[PDB]
Design a protein around this ligand. Structure first.
Ligand SMILES: *C(=O)N1C[C@H](NOS(=O)(=O)O)CC[C@H]1C(N)=O
Length: 260
């Protein structure tokens, strides 16, 4: 297929390893490139942690309003929102929003804590039928993105399927799903990734991530106007530990998928 040849060429031009999964919910068709290879998730894993807490809130109806202390000891490498509330509290809703929309790593660690450790996040993946996702570590070490290391990885195919179920499907209750969709649509970190390769008019909710080995990721739900939505996962990683991020590769992959 032409899309396959163009993604392969993009990959060749980039010097890295590119993973793409597209699901067209119009006809449930899929486009995959290295769809079954493992990639480090880095911050894209936060969608699963947030969704897991939302699933808890279906029975614990006030859970999202639960205050959680932010202490100095809780701060890690990237805490844009949590640092604003040190020695105070944030609710689990606020932590979820911070994790998703600003990619706050302290917020992610509080979500993991709420779920009883990385094993609790992974259990939620298994619960909704994702047998591929694995979260092994907490922030910041889950972003080491070491080649061949299976920790904290998933595949593009798996992540696309799961993101579909969480946002467009019914893995979550209706109020929860709507909340997740709202958070994703309000992401502030994605302008140069998938979004940059799509028609400006299209509505996108996404979660970015990056890590060592120039790992550069984005997962997205896309709502074209007058057309069934799409799920697009783009993972990218490189052979040098100190490689720079390549968000342009993700934008380019999205463009190739969109029809450009
Ligand atoms: C997620 O991959 N991380 C936390 C934060 N994410 O910002 S990003 O999604 O815009 O890339 C910074 C990078 C990364 C990390 N190494 O902690």
């Amino acid at each position: 297929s032409a899309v396959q040849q163009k993604l392969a060429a993009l990959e060749k031009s980039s010097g890295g390893r590119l993973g793409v999964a597209l699901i067209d919910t119009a006809d449930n068709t899929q486009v995959l490139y290295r769809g079954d290879e493992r990639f480090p998730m880095c911050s894209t894993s936060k969608v699963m942690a947030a969704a897991a807490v939302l699933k808890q809130s279906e029975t614990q109806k006030q859970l999202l309003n639960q205050p959680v202390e932010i202490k100095p000891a809780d701060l890690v490498n990237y805490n844009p929102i949590a640092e604003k509330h040190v020695n105070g509290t944030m609710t689990l809703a606020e932590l979820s929003a911070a994790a998703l929309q600003y990619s706050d790593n302290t917020a992610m660690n509080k979500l993991i804590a709420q779920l009883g450790g990385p094993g609790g996040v992974t259990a939620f993946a298994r619960a909704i039928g994702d047998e591929t996702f694995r979260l092994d570590r907490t922030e910041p070490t889950l972003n080491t993105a070491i080649p061949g290391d299976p920790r904290d990885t998933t595949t593009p195919r798996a992540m696309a399927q799961t993101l579909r179920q969480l946002t467009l499907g019914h893995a979550l209750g209706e109020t929860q799903r709507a909340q997740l969709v709202t958070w994703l649509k309000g992401n502030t970190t994605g302008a140069a990734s998938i979004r940059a390769g799509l028609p400006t008019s299209w509505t996108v909710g996404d979660k970015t991530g990056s890590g060592d080995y120039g790992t550069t990721n984005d997962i997205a739900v896309i709502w074209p106007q007058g057309r069934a939505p799409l799920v697009l996962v783009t993972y990218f990683t490189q052979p040098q530990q100190n490689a720079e991020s390549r968000r342009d590769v993700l934008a380019s992959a999205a463009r190739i998928i969109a029809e450009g």
